[PDB]
Ligand binder design. Structure first.
Ligand SMILES: CCCCCCCC/C=C/CCCCCCCC(=O)O[C@@H](COC(=O)CCCCCCCCCCCCCCC)COP(=O)([O-])OCC[N+](C)(C)C
Ligand SMILES: CCCCCCCC/C=C/CCCCCCCC(=O)O[C@@H](COC(=O)CCCCCCCCCCCCCCC)COP(=O)([O-])OCC[N+](C)(C)C
Ligand SMILES: CCCCCCCC/C=C/CCCCCCCC(=O)O[C@@H](COC(=O)CCCCCCCCCCCCCCC)COP(=O)([O-])OCC[N+](C)(C)C
Ligand SMILES: CCCCCCCC/C=C/CCCCCCCC(=O)O[C@@H](COC(=O)CCCCCCCCCCCCCCC)COP(=O)([O-])OCC[N+](C)(C)C
Ligand SMILES: CCCCCCCC/C=C\CCCCCCCC(=O)O[C@@H](COC(=O)CCCCCCCCCCCCCCC)COP(=O)([O-])OCC[N+](C)(C)C
Ligand SMILES: CCCCCCCC/C=C\CCCCCCCC(=O)O[C@@H](COC(=O)CCCCCCCCCCCCCCC)COP(=O)([O-])OCC[N+](C)(C)C
Ligand SMILES: C[C@@H]1CC[C@@]2(OC1)O[C@H]1C[C@H]3[C@@H]4CC=C5C[C@@H](OCCC(CO)CO)CC[C@]5(C)[C@H]4CC[C@]3(C)[C@H]1[C@@H]2C
Ligand SMILES: C[C@@H]1CC[C@@]2(OC1)O[C@H]1C[C@H]3[C@@H]4CC=C5C[C@@H](OCCC(CO)CO)CC[C@]5(C)[C@H]4CC[C@]3(C)[C@H]1[C@@H]2C
Ligand SMILES: [Ca+2]
Lengths: 92, 92
């Protein structure tokens, strides 16, 4: 679940924030939102940053249409596979 | 879960956005919100678009009172039936 969390966070942070000098915020922002996503959050007005209903209308640019797909695959893997692998674990 | 997701998304998008020329956004918007709904999101200030507490006071019009019902049935089917069909699957 932390390999799935960087599989999504490193592309999401690269695809969306491409003018990043080296920083420690590149250590949070590849781990931060993909962790809270597991716990009910979706950041719905940050998915599809080029949409009109965006809290991030400045993150729009080349390649940012990939992140709704990455995140779709992410949460499917988190909730529908890995969280139910915990539940199944805790049951048995 | 993707038949339930278009069973809700195609009516929700037709009942609410009825002046739609053909577009590729009719390929996202019938699949987009009903997927994030599965993962904690409800879009609470977009249900009942004619309510006062609406992020969508312009989507109000004839027939939009149907979507709180469609969505009620949707999530009942997603969470309370299909997500617990996954959990039950992953257990056994
Ligand atoms: C292989 C296993 C099976 C996979 C299943 C299928 C996989 C998914 C298939 C989805 C169908 C294809 C959808 C995109 C179509 C083109 C979009 C487009 O042209 O523009 C869109 C751009 O926005 C995007 O391109 C973002 C990507 C869409 C969301 C991805 C799906 C995630 C949720 C669902 C995942 C599961 C759904 C389940 C399906 C029932 C919107 O239009 P625009 O105007 O260009 O943008 C606004 C910009 N503006 C404000 C500046 C104007
Ligand atoms: C499934 C049931 C639903 C319907 C199905 C029918 C599908 C028909 C779809 C057809 C796709 C083609 C339409 C888009 C091209 C036109 C231009 C366009 O909008 O470009 C967009 C590129 O966005 C994309 O390229 C979207 C993703 C393309 C793949 C579609 C899903 C593949 C099938 C599923 C499997 C995939 C894997 C999923 C995981 C397993 C960019 O537009 P924007 O984002 O608005 O950015 C604009 C702002 N900017 C200029 C600053 C950048
Ligand atoms: C067979 C199995 C049984 C199923 C169960 C029962 C089914 C549900 C039964 C529901 C009772 C009926 C409710 C609607 C009553 C009429 C509403 C009305 O006239 O006005 C309302 C309009 O808003 C709507 O019409 C939206 C529809 C109602 C919400 C849907 C319920 C979903 C959640 C519950 C689902 C779980 C139910 C749990 C039950 C305990 C509000 O007033 P207004 O002022 O017109 O609106 C503001 C507009 N204005 C700003 C322009 C003024
Ligand atoms: C359960 C316990 C709770 C209470 C029970 C008692 C129930 C009493 C209910 C009575 C309903 C009649 C009252 C409304 C009629 C007056 C006019 C009106 O306000 O119309 C509204 C339409 O809203 C509707 O038509 C509401 C939905 C009708 C069905 C109600 C549930 C049936 C029982 C459950 C089975 C259903 C299936 C459920 C799923 C299995 C329009 O108002 P608006 O929406 O604000 O939009 C107006 C704005 N506009 C002009 C721009 C358009
Ligand atoms: C059965 C289903 C199979 C489908 C599978 C998917 C196949 C299709 C895959 C990908 C479709 C690629 C085309 C969509 C982008 C067009 C829009 C665009 O250019 O947007 C932006 C840039 O976008 C880019 O710069 C993206 C460049 C192409 C893709 C880059 C690699 C990612 C895909 C890797 C492969 C992933 C494969 C995944 C396989 C699972 C900007 O828009 P513009 O128009 O350039 O200019 C601005 C707008 N204006 C001019 C109006 C002002
Ligand atoms: C035991 C329980 C069983 C109950 C079952 C449900 C039975 C009840 C069924 C239906 C209730 C229909 C009446 C409610 C709407 C009235 C308000 C209205 O007209 O709103 C708007 C339009 O609304 C429309 O154009 C809707 C037209 C009728 C319904 C269309 C088919 C959908 C239901 C299919 C059947 C579903 C069957 C589902 C069965 C599971 C506009 O408002 P107005 O008033 O036109 O004028 C403007 C407002 N003003 C004048 C104040 C300025
Ligand atoms: C197996 C896993 C693969 C992924 C991963 O773990 C192991 O690989 C690690 C490598 C790390 C980076 C290494 C070096 C730096 C330079 C630093 O520069 C300070 C500059 C300035 C600040 O202003 C000082 O003043 C910023 C941080 C950064 C980019 C790391 C970020 C986290 C990264 C990407 C880690 C990531 C979680
Ligand atoms: C069994 C399932 C039943 C539901 C469903 O899957 C199979 O049936 C599919 C039919 C698809 C539409 C067919 C043709 C077009 C025309 C196109 O026109 C470009 C216009 C312009 C852009 O501005 C060009 O420049 C836009 C897309 C649209 C409306 C499709 C959307 C997705 C739909 C609704 C699919 C939906 C998920
Ligand atoms: Ca939740």
């Amino acid at each position: 679940m932390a390999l799935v969390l960087l599989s999504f966070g490193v592309p999401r942070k690269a695809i969306l924030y491409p003018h990043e000098e080296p920083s420690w915020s590149l250590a949070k922002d590849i781990v931060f939102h993909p962790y809270w996503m597991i716990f009910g959050e979706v950041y719905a007005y940050e998915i599809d940053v080029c949409a009109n209903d965006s809290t991030l209308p400045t993150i729009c640019g080349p390649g940012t249409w990939l992140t709704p797909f990455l995140q779709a695959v992410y949460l499917f893997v988190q909730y529908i596979i890995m969280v139910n692998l915990l539940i199944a674990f805790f049951n048995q």
